[PDB]
Amino acid sequence: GSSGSSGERREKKNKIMQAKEDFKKMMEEAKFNPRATFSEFAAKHAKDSRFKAIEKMKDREALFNEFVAAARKKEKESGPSSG
Numbered sequence: 001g002s003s004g005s006s007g008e009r010r011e012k013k014n015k016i017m018q019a020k021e022d023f024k025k026m027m028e029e030a031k032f033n034p035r036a037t038f039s040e041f042a043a044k045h046a047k048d049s050r051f052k053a054i055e056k057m058k059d060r061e062a063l064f065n066e067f068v069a070a071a072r073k074k075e076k077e078s079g080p081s082s083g
């Protein structure tokens with residue numbers, strides 16, 4: 001089945017952006033395999049201070065789910081944002 005979040009509550013600070021960046025970027029560099037599970041990935045890159053920034057389980061599962069969702073295949077039925 002599908003999962004994820006819809007409409008989060010950001011604060012009046014540049015904390016989220018910063019983190020999200022280090023996270024999304026940190027993973028992009030790792031170029032890990034989609035076969036692995038979120039749990040493993042988390043622990044694998046848990047020591048990474050930046051990674052620690054993302055505690056909100058939902059946030060991790062979400063950011064990860066999307067990352068792997070695209071990593072495996074790009075030409076798939078997906079279109080959350082137009083841009």
